[PDB]
Structure formats: C-alpha cells, structure tokens
Design an enzyme around this catalytic site. Structure first.
Site, PDB file in Angstrom:
ATOM      1  N   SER A   1       2.207  -9.429   4.465  1.00  0.00           N
ATOM      2  CA  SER A   1       0.906 -10.073   4.361  1.00  0.00           C
ATOM      3  C   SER A   1       1.060 -11.572   4.104  1.00  0.00           C
ATOM      4  CB  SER A   1       0.063  -9.422   3.299  1.00  0.00           C
ATOM      5  OG  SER A   1      -0.622  -8.305   3.832  1.00  0.00           O
TER       6      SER A   1
ATOM      7  N   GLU B   1       1.699  -0.363   7.751  1.00  0.00           N
ATOM      8  CA  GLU B   1       0.449  -1.099   7.693  1.00  0.00           C
ATOM      9  C   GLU B   1      -0.712  -0.110   7.716  1.00  0.00           C
ATOM     10  OE1 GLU B   1       0.028  -2.334  12.309  1.00  0.00           O
ATOM     11  OE2 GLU B   1       0.940  -3.883  11.059  1.00  0.00           O
TER      12      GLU B   1
ATOM     13  N   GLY C   1      -3.234 -10.848   3.493  1.00  0.00           N
ATOM     14  CA  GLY C   1      -3.033 -12.285   3.532  1.00  0.00           C
ATOM     15  C   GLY C   1      -3.836 -12.934   4.655  1.00  0.00           C
ATOM     16  N   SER C   2      -4.298 -14.162   4.395  1.00  0.00           N
ATOM     17  CA  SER C   2      -5.093 -14.910   5.352  1.00  0.00           C
ATOM     18  C   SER C   2      -4.923 -16.402   5.081  1.00  0.00           C
ATOM     19  CB  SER C   2      -6.539 -14.496   5.284  1.00  0.00           C
ATOM     20  OG  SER C   2      -7.311 -15.121   6.306  1.00  0.00           O
TER      21      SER C   2
ATOM     22  N   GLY D   1     -15.209 -17.723   3.293  1.00  0.00           N
ATOM     23  CA  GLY D   1     -15.979 -16.641   3.888  1.00  0.00           C
ATOM     24  C   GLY D   1     -15.605 -15.274   3.316  1.00  0.00           C
TER      25      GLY D   1
ATOM     26  N   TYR E   1       0.782 -14.189   6.761  1.00  0.00           N
ATOM     27  CA  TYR E   1      -0.497 -14.477   7.394  1.00  0.00           C
ATOM     28  C   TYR E   1      -1.255 -15.544   6.604  1.00  0.00           C
ATOM     29  CZ  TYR E   1       0.961 -10.690  10.415  1.00  0.00           C
ATOM     30  OH  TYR E   1       1.643  -9.901  11.299  1.00  0.00           O
TER      31      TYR E   1
HETATM   32  N1  CNA Z   1       1.433  -9.968  13.879  1.00  0.00           N
HETATM   33  C1  CNA Z   1       1.457  -9.992  15.207  1.00  0.00           C
HETATM   34  O1  CNA Z   1       0.441  -9.755  15.881  1.00  0.00           O
HETATM   35  C2  CNA Z   1       2.747 -10.310  15.908  1.00  0.00           C
HETATM   36  C3  CNA Z   1       2.744 -10.456  17.289  1.00  0.00           C
HETATM   37  C4  CNA Z   1       3.920 -10.766  17.947  1.00  0.00           C
HETATM   38  C5  CNA Z   1       5.088 -10.928  17.229  1.00  0.00           C
HETATM   39  N2  CNA Z   1       5.077 -10.789  15.865  1.00  0.00           N
HETATM   40  C6  CNA Z   1       6.375 -10.978  15.172  1.00  0.00           C
HETATM   41  C7  CNA Z   1       7.301  -9.751  15.270  1.00  0.00           C
HETATM   42  C8  CNA Z   1       7.944  -9.592  13.882  1.00  0.00           C
HETATM   43  C9  CNA Z   1       7.323  -8.454  13.101  1.00  0.00           C
HETATM   44  O2  CNA Z   1       7.524  -8.709  11.691  1.00  0.00           O
HETATM   45  P1  CNA Z   1       6.800  -7.837  10.570  1.00  0.00           P
HETATM   46  O3  CNA Z   1       5.318  -8.032  10.632  1.00  0.00           O
HETATM   47  O4  CNA Z   1       7.438  -8.064   9.246  1.00  0.00           O
HETATM   48  O5  CNA Z   1       7.255  -6.385  11.079  1.00  0.00           O
HETATM   49  P2  CNA Z   1       6.604  -4.920  11.235  1.00  0.00           P
HETATM   50  O6  CNA Z   1       7.434  -4.195  12.244  1.00  0.00           O
HETATM   51  O7  CNA Z   1       6.381  -4.314   9.882  1.00  0.00           O
HETATM   52  O8  CNA Z   1       5.184  -5.277  11.884  1.00  0.00           O
HETATM   53  C10 CNA Z   1       5.105  -5.563  13.298  1.00  0.00           C
HETATM   54  C11 CNA Z   1       3.781  -6.233  13.555  1.00  0.00           C
HETATM   55  O9  CNA Z   1       3.561  -6.322  14.982  1.00  0.00           O
HETATM   56  C12 CNA Z   1       2.441  -5.550  15.352  1.00  0.00           C
HETATM   57  N3  CNA Z   1       2.789  -4.758  16.519  1.00  0.00           N
HETATM   58  C13 CNA Z   1       3.882  -3.935  16.645  1.00  0.00           C
HETATM   59  N4  CNA Z   1       3.934  -3.314  17.795  1.00  0.00           N
HETATM   60  C14 CNA Z   1       2.793  -3.739  18.461  1.00  0.00           C
HETATM   61  C15 CNA Z   1       2.277  -3.433  19.731  1.00  0.00           C
HETATM   62  N5  CNA Z   1       2.864  -2.591  20.575  1.00  0.00           N
HETATM   63  N6  CNA Z   1       1.115  -4.029  20.090  1.00  0.00           N
HETATM   64  C16 CNA Z   1       0.531  -4.874  19.227  1.00  0.00           C
HETATM   65  N7  CNA Z   1       0.925  -5.241  18.010  1.00  0.00           N
HETATM   66  C17 CNA Z   1       2.075  -4.629  17.681  1.00  0.00           C
HETATM   67  C18 CNA Z   1       2.090  -4.654  14.170  1.00  0.00           C
HETATM   68  O10 CNA Z   1       0.716  -4.333  14.233  1.00  0.00           O
HETATM   69  C19 CNA Z   1       2.554  -5.511  12.987  1.00  0.00           C
HETATM   70  O11 CNA Z   1       1.597  -6.463  12.544  1.00  0.00           O
HETATM   71  C20 CNA Z   1       7.746 -10.977  13.243  1.00  0.00           C
HETATM   72  O12 CNA Z   1       8.667 -11.950  13.709  1.00  0.00           O
HETATM   73  C21 CNA Z   1       6.302 -11.263  13.666  1.00  0.00           C
HETATM   74  O13 CNA Z   1       5.925 -12.583  13.310  1.00  0.00           O
HETATM   75  C22 CNA Z   1       3.939 -10.488  15.207  1.00  0.00           C
HETATM   76  N1  DQV Z   2      -3.602  -9.722   7.472  1.00  0.00           N
HETATM   77  C1  DQV Z   2      -2.618  -9.033   6.917  1.00  0.00           C
HETATM   78  O1  DQV Z   2      -2.373  -9.121   5.704  1.00  0.00           O
HETATM   79  C2  DQV Z   2      -1.854  -8.070   7.775  1.00  0.00           C
HETATM   80  C3  DQV Z   2      -1.292  -6.931   7.204  1.00  0.00           C
HETATM   81  C4  DQV Z   2      -0.602  -6.027   7.989  1.00  0.00           C
HETATM   82  C5  DQV Z   2      -0.475  -6.246   9.355  1.00  0.00           C
HETATM   83  C6  DQV Z   2      -1.061  -7.355   9.947  1.00  0.00           C
HETATM   84  C7  DQV Z   2      -0.882  -7.598  11.430  1.00  0.00           C
HETATM   85  O2  DQV Z   2      -1.581  -8.764  11.872  1.00  0.00           O
HETATM   86  C8  DQV Z   2      -2.522  -8.432  12.916  1.00  0.00           C
HETATM   87  C9  DQV Z   2      -3.766  -9.237  12.677  1.00  0.00           C
HETATM   88  O3  DQV Z   2      -4.085  -9.171  11.269  1.00  0.00           O
HETATM   89  P1  DQV Z   2      -5.319 -10.065  10.757  1.00  0.00           P
HETATM   90  O4  DQV Z   2      -5.703  -9.652   9.373  1.00  0.00           O
HETATM   91  O5  DQV Z   2      -5.055 -11.513  11.024  1.00  0.00           O
HETATM   92  O6  DQV Z   2      -6.500  -9.590  11.725  1.00  0.00           O
HETATM   93  P2  DQV Z   2      -7.382 -10.375  12.798  1.00  0.00           P
HETATM   94  O7  DQV Z   2      -8.639  -9.612  13.036  1.00  0.00           O
HETATM   95  O8  DQV Z   2      -6.512 -10.706  13.964  1.00  0.00           O
HETATM   96  O9  DQV Z   2      -7.703 -11.714  11.982  1.00  0.00           O
HETATM   97  C10 DQV Z   2      -9.002 -11.975  11.392  1.00  0.00           C
HETATM   98  C11 DQV Z   2      -8.806 -12.888  10.204  1.00  0.00           C
HETATM   99  O10 DQV Z   2     -10.082 -13.153   9.566  1.00  0.00           O
HETATM  100  C12 DQV Z   2      -9.937 -13.025   8.173  1.00  0.00           C
HETATM  101  N2  DQV Z   2     -11.241 -12.714   7.596  1.00  0.00           N
HETATM  102  C13 DQV Z   2     -11.651 -11.540   7.017  1.00  0.00           C
HETATM  103  N3  DQV Z   2     -12.893 -11.589   6.597  1.00  0.00           N
HETATM  104  C14 DQV Z   2     -13.319 -12.874   6.906  1.00  0.00           C
HETATM  105  C15 DQV Z   2     -14.538 -13.550   6.703  1.00  0.00           C
HETATM  106  N4  DQV Z   2     -15.602 -12.994   6.130  1.00  0.00           N
HETATM  107  N5  DQV Z   2     -14.617 -14.837   7.122  1.00  0.00           N
HETATM  108  C16 DQV Z   2     -13.539 -15.387   7.700  1.00  0.00           C
HETATM  109  N6  DQV Z   2     -12.346 -14.850   7.942  1.00  0.00           N
HETATM  110  C17 DQV Z   2     -12.302 -13.578   7.513  1.00  0.00           C
HETATM  111  C18 DQV Z   2      -8.870 -11.951   7.991  1.00  0.00           C
HETATM  112  O11 DQV Z   2      -8.285 -11.987   6.709  1.00  0.00           O
HETATM  113  C19 DQV Z   2      -7.889 -12.328   9.106  1.00  0.00           C
HETATM  114  O12 DQV Z   2      -6.918 -13.283   8.695  1.00  0.00           O
HETATM  115  C20 DQV Z   2      -2.709  -6.916  12.835  1.00  0.00           C
HETATM  116  O13 DQV Z   2      -2.972  -6.342  14.113  1.00  0.00           O
HETATM  117  C21 DQV Z   2      -1.329  -6.464  12.353  1.00  0.00           C
HETATM  118  O14 DQV Z   2      -0.415  -6.309  13.422  1.00  0.00           O
HETATM  119  C22 DQV Z   2      -1.761  -8.257   9.154  1.00  0.00           C
END
Ligand code: CNA
Ligand code: DQV
Length: 238
Positions: free
Chosen positions: A132, A216, A91-92, A99, A135
C-alpha cells in the site's frame, strides 16, 4: 487552533485557515498515544509486514491518528456484524486525502479505465504495509506519505489466484481476495476490538499457482469500509 500540533501539521499537508479546513474534512481526528496498546500494535503491523521485495526504503511512523468519519459508522452498521472483518492498508496520494476523509473511500469512477484492474473496479486493500505504501507515491524530495487502516467487512471471500474481470460476486461472497505467494504469518494474528489484524511476519502462503506476490482485498460496496486509523509515514530511501 485548539488542536494538537501533529494534527495541524496534517491539515496543511493535506491542503495545498486550518480550523475551517478541519470542519471540511467532516472527520474527528485524534492523536493516538505513542505508548498506548493501539500504537504498539499498529507499529508492530508496520514493522512485520514491510515486504522483502520493497527494498527501496524503510518506514518510520511519525504520527498515528484515530479518524472517525462523520456518518460512516452508521453506514457500516449493516456489515458491522459480518464475520471475518480485517484491519487493512490503503495507500493513496496525499492530494487525494482531502476527498478521502470528507467523502470516504469510493470506487473508481465510471470514466476511469477498467482494463487496468486485476479484480475489477472496487476498493483495494493490502495486509502488507509496503504494498500500500507504494501508492502514496512518495519520492526522494517528498518522503512523507499518508496511509489508511480500514476496518474492512470481508465476510466470505472469493479467493482468486489469477486476474478475474468481475462484475458480480458468486452467491454467498461479499469480497474478493487475491492470494499472494507471501502472507502475514496467520498463526501470529491478533484481534483488536472485534477486528482481525494480520501483523505476522511474511511467510510463504503455500499457494503455488498464483500470479501475486502479496495478498490483496477488494470490496464493491463503499459501505463495507470503516476508516479507523490514519498514519503519517516517513519513507527512508536507501
Ligand atoms: N499496481 C499496478 O496496477 C501495477 C501495474 C503494472 C505493474 N506493477 C508493478 C509490478 C510489481 C508488483 O509489485 P507488488 O504490488 O508488490 O506485487 P503483488 O504481486 O503483491 O501485486 C501485483 C499487483 O499487480 C496487479 N496485477 C497482477 N496481475 C494483474 C493482471 N493480470 N491484471 C491487472 N493487474 C494485475 C495486482 O492487482 C497488484 O496490485 C511492482 O513493480 C509494481 O509496481 C503494478
Ligand atoms: N491502494 C492500495 O493501497 C492498493 C492495495 C492493494 C493493491 C493495489 C493495486 O493497485 C490497483 C489500483 O489501486 P488504487 O487504490 O489506486 O485504485 P484506483 O481505483 O485505480 O485508484 C483510485 C484512487 O482514488 C483514491 N480515492 C478513494 N476515495 C477517494 C475520494 N473520495 N476522493 C479522491 N480519491 C479517492 C484511492 O485511494 C485510489 O488511490 C489495484 O488494482 C491493485 O492492483 C492498491
């Protein structure tokens, strides 16, 4: 325009002249029949993998597109033969998909911050739609998101339970898997074409010592991703 109505809707949703803009996506977008096997499968994926933690909304599938990025198929030919390929959610923000469809899913750039990532700068995926979906950054006043289904060539996974700042995979490994506490029931997996689809209902994974709620998946080469479907999702907030 000589394109099905749902496609034209999609084009405007992304941009913000239609036929000119479809040529810029460099992508072959087709509408998947609602009564087809593909759609029945894809909607079953979306139903079962909507997670209990994500009570904020229900999802309804408006349209299913069979995307085929120009040149991506050939780029993925190496890893096409690789074992254990799954179809996973990415998801994005809707703004990005311009892009994403033209250039494909790319790694977070050098300029981006590296501290924020759990498993380093790679391309993240999920087997739970609600993970996803979050996001897409849809809200009350903008409740239509876009979400990808990528064929991800995972191969041998480096299955981690805890934050690891990776700059190199161990030898034999081509992907990382963050082990969640809850996983799509593995006995209810199905194989669409050559790809595994983890569309079972969420059950306890049996992993006790992990910081993640859901699995993930991370890959560090852009070529390991083959975009297959692109879903138009309606978020029905509670
Ligand atoms: N996506 C993020 O970067 C992030 C950051 C801070 C809080 N949260 C919230 C915490 C909570 C998680 O939900 P959900 O995604 O369903 O659960 P989940 O437990 O399946 O995923 C946890 C998320 O947090 C990330 N994460 C976990 N531990 C760490 C760490 N030590 N350092 C960096 N990233 C880490 C992991 O990569 C994943 O995207 C939600 O309320 C999120 O919105 C997310
Ligand atoms: N994104 C998820 O669905 C997702 C799934 C499982 C777990 C997570 C959790 O979120 C953390 C971040 O995830 P994120 O995908 O946002 O990665 P991050 O690197 O921070 O973000 C870059 C963004 O750029 C988009 N993009 C890709 N190609 C292009 C392109 N050509 N032009 C423009 N934009 C592009 C891409 O989709 C994303 O949204 C990760 O650390 C993890 O904790 C996400």
């Amino acid at each position: 325009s000589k394109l099905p109505k749902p496609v034209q809707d999609l084009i405007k949703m992304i941009f913000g002249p239609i036929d000119v803009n479809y040529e810029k996506l460099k992508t072959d977008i087709k509408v998947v029949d609602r009564d087809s096997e593909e759609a029945e499968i894809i909607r079953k994926y979306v139903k079962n993998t909507h997670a209990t933690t994500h009570n904020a909304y229900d999802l309804e599938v408006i349209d299913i597109f069979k995307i085929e990025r120009e040149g991506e198929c050939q780029r993925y030919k190496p890893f096409k033969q690789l074992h254990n390929r799954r179809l996973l959610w990415h998801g994005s923000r809707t703004t990005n998909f311009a892009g994403i469809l033209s250039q494909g899913l790319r790694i977070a750039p050098p300029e981006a911050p590296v501290t924020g990532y759990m498993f380093g700068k790679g391309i993240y995926f999920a087997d739970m739609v609600s993970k996803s979906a979050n996001y897409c950054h849809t809200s009350q006043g903008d409740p239509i998101g876009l979400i990808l289904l990528g064929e991800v060539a995972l191969g041998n996974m480096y299955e981690l339970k805890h934050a690891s700042h990776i700059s190199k995979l161990p030898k034999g490994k081509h992907s990382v898997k963050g082990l969640g506490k809850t996983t799509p029931d593995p006995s209810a997996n199905i194989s669409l074409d050559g790809v595994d689809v983890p569309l079972g209902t969420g059950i306890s994974s049996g992993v006790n010592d992990t910081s993640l709620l859901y699995n993930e998946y991370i890959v560090y080469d852009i070529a390991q991703v083959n975009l297959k479907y692109l879903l138009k999702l309606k978020f029905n907030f509670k």
